[PDB]
């Protein structure tokens, strides 16, 4: 049975990466909210 | 000072007992072969023939405190196997 999560690093960074968040105004809104909450990880670019 | 420390180990001892013109250094991860070569010439006054390099990432480790557990990492480094000209040692 195929499950919902099928990993792909290129797709992950294209969809949720730091540059894609910075591209639009609402992505920068998301980044500002996460910084205000104080999250240790800001985007999926942080994980390794 | 890109060179950090020499490599003392069984593999290095075996290769030096075999060839005797080969020496292993641990250097900064961003130093390429030309600068590793110039640096060893400066630090030891020898002529260098060839350089082989490989990048190592740090080992992941488990720091143990009184309450629980923390996840940490060691620093990354670069290995540099150095071949001197036939006739010289370190």
């Amino acid at each position: 049975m195929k499950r919902t999560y099928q990993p792909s690093n290129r797709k992950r960074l294209n969809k949720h990466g730091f540059r894609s968040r910075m591209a639009t105004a609402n992505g920068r809104r998301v980044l500002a909210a996460r910084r205000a909450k104080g999250r240790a990880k800001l985007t999926v670019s942080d994980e390794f | 000072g890109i060179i950090i420390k020499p490599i003392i180990s069984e593999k290095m001892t075996a290769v030096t007992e075999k060839m005797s013109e080969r020496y292993g250094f641990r250097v900064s991860p961003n130093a390429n072969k030309i600068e590793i070569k110039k640096a060893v010439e400066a630090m030891y006054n020898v002529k260098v023939e060839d350089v082989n390099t490989m990048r190592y990432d740090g080992k992941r480790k488990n720091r143990y405190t009184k309450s629980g557990l923390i996840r940490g990492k060691e620093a990354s480094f670069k290995k540099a196997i150095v071949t001197l000209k036939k006739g010289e040692t370190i």
């Binding site: - | 000072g1 420390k5 020499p6 400066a42 630090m43």
Partner: protein, 63 residues
């Protein structure tokens, strides 16, 4: 060497001593890893002295 002695240099012998001390510190750093030194505080001393020399050279160049 001390702060007063370093400040009592001539900005050319000081530079020559700067490169000499840098090379010496690299040699001691390489040697201490192979053989653990009896008094490793010489490394801290040499590092601080290099920082002091660069500070004095920057002071002389800027003013």
């Amino acid at each position: 060497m001390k702060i007063a002695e370093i400040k009592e240099l001539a900005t050319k012998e000081l530079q020559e001593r700067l490169d000499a001390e840098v090379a010496a510190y690299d040699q001691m750093r390489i040697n201490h890893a192979v053989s653990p030194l009896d008094s490793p505080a010489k490394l801290k001393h040499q590092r601080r002295m290099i920082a002091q020399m660069k500070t004095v050279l920057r002071q002389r160049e800027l003013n």
